[PDB]
Amino acid sequence: RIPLVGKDSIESKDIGFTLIHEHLRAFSEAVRQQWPHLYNEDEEFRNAVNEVKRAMQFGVKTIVDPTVMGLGRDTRFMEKVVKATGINLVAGTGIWIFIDLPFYFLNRSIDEIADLFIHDIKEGIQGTPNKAGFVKIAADEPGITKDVEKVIRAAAIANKETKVPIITHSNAHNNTGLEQQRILTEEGVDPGKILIGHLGDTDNIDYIKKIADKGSFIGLDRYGVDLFLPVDKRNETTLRLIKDGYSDKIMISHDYWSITLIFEDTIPFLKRNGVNEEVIATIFKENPKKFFS
Amino acid sequence: MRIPLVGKDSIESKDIGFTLIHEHLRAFSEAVRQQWPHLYNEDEEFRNAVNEVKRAMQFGVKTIVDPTVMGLGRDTRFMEKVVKATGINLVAGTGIWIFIDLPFYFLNRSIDEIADLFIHDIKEGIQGTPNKAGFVKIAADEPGITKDVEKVIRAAAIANKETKVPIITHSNAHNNTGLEQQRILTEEGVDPGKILIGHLGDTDNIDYIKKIADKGSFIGLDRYGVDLFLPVDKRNETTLRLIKDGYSDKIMISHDYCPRWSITLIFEDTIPFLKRNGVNEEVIATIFKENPKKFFS
Ligand SMILES: [Co+2]
Ligand SMILES: [Co+2]
Ligand SMILES: [Fe+2]
Ligand SMILES: [Fe+2]
């Protein structure tokens, strides 16, 4: 029921321990095509493989990679790492923009954009048989611009036609997440199929709860990126939200400084502060299972 | 020994010949095409590329300047794959086509870092091919001159000083963006006659077109066939008005071709029209030969 990169599908029950938001590799499609002398596919590949290998050491079974248009999605690269590690990797479709769309989308309808997403879900991605397993959309400081709203509505339509869930990028300080959730549910999207991301960058604990209360997963997913909020402020927001019994809605990731910083810092901090392996299992196993259920 | 070419060796800026200064063999969004290749068809775009190039050589075009850059799908492998089938003098370029923001890769990065990336295309080559870049292409439009748009403008000027190359721009004829690019590049001390300000033929406000021409810069009447911005006869009215008002030395004409829109509509219409309205053969040589020669000298 969940498509995978270079494997057969899996039942949502078998997803296992999951990191819900990690980037194997991410870049601007335009910058790379026009100046490859700034990149190297040799170092990029090895670091992907070894980081994943470590992640499999610590017990990570499944990785969800929300690299889409605007972030350099390459399914050929993804089927490489799957070959070299055997990891369960979920790829998605969608559009990552903050203001306007590429000039190609001038005079194109929302149903024209959803077709692209529905194409990646039903037929495959970039020619390969790898199919999308979720849609990814984004909003930030500019808030909900009109092209950003076109993208949100194109995701709601793909969700209703394929029932794959939606991951969002948002800005924690300007209400974009709540607006994403408001527009998506209005269009019929089940709240439980929505992950509002990048809420770790805030401490307005009542804003986070307002999103969780409406039935969507909340993203505490920017560890290691210590330029937004220090980790030991993130770990207290997480713990606070866990002490209030919100672990059924909490989702934690790195947004990738390494892809094991949670096993080194986050999880050990939490287990020292009370949370049993039930809470840890709710966040990294059961919540991903409902999200793809 | 001056103007690099795609699939060929360098020529002097006075062997340039009959130039179409602004044409696109192909244009697309790198981000859209990399993600949804089922939308495109390289083979059809190869046949149409070659068809229209050689048919422009039938009418005597010797050189086509192509300002397809970052944001417009520049691909020198496709370019020299068309040169091999036509023998055209193709001038590739470097630069950044944006209207609001730069890609996130450029976040916190510096004006000189961007300029270093144009100079890599000019001095070392483009996309790891031995094809170099003969000019810098920058852009502005309806969003106005914004912060990152202004950083690419100045990044271009810095490539002008070091490399010498001229600078083709894309503006919006209806909001003084073209003038502001000139106001910014020259206030940065670039040779005004090394700036071609583009798409001025989209308006019939002659006074605005002349103010840019008077300040020393080439004006671009370069979207022939695109009737959504201005119909053809209304463009022939403006081009003629500008010729008979003295400005033939700072006029450049092209199609910007990526109704009756092709890459030879000026030979099928505009040039017969101008001849029968008092334009002799030496002024059309000024427009398609002399003005290019100077731009690249
Ligand atoms: Co993100
Ligand atoms: Co243009
Ligand atoms: Fe991300
Ligand atoms: Fe153009």
Residue numbers in the entry:
A (entry chain A): 2 to 257, 278 to 314
B (entry chain B): 1 to 258, 276 to 314
Article passage:
αsB5 (V27A-I76T-Y97W-Y99F-L130P-L226V) is the only selected mutant that does not contain a substitution of position W263. In the two other mutants, αsD6 and αsB5, loop 8 could not be modeled due to the lack of electronic density, which was likely to be due to the high level of motion of this enzyme region. Analysis of the normalized thermal motion B-factor supports this hypothesis. Structures reveal that αsB5 mutations have a destabilizing effect on loop 8, as illustrated by the B factor analysis. The two selected variants, namely αsB5 and αsD6, which lost the thiono-effect have only two mutations in common: V27A and Y97W. Both residues are located relatively close to the bi-metallic active site, yet do not interact directly with the metals (V27-Fe: 6.7 Å, Y97-Co: 4.3 Å). Because W263 substitutions were previously shown to be key for increasing SsoPox’s phosphotriesterase activity, we used saturation mutagenesis to introduce W263 mutations to the background of αsB5. The best selected mutants against paraoxon were found to be αsB5-W263I/L/M. Surprisingly, none of these mutants demonstrated an increase in phosphotriesterase activity in comparison with αsB5, but rather a decrease in activity. For example, with ethyl-paraoxon as a substrate, W263M and αsB5 produce a catalytic efficiency improvement of 14 and 67-fold, respectively, while the combination αsB5-W263M increases activity only 11-fold. The destabilizing effect of these mutations can also be observed on the overall enzyme stability, with αsB5, W263M, αsB5-W263M exhibiting Tm values of 70.4 °C, 85.3 °C and 69.1 °C, respectively, as compared to 106 °C for the wt enzyme.
Phosphotriesterase-like Lactonases (PLLs) are appealing candidates, being natural lactonases endowed with promiscuous phosphotriesterase activity. PTEs and PLLs belong to the amidohydrolase superfamily, and share the same (β/α)8 barrel topology. SsoPox exhibits high acyl-homoserine lactones and oxo-lactones hydrolysis abilities, and promiscuous, low phosphotriesterase activity. SsoPox is a very appealing candidate for the bioremediation of phosphotriesters because of its unique thermal stability, and its ability to resist aging, solvent and protease treatments.
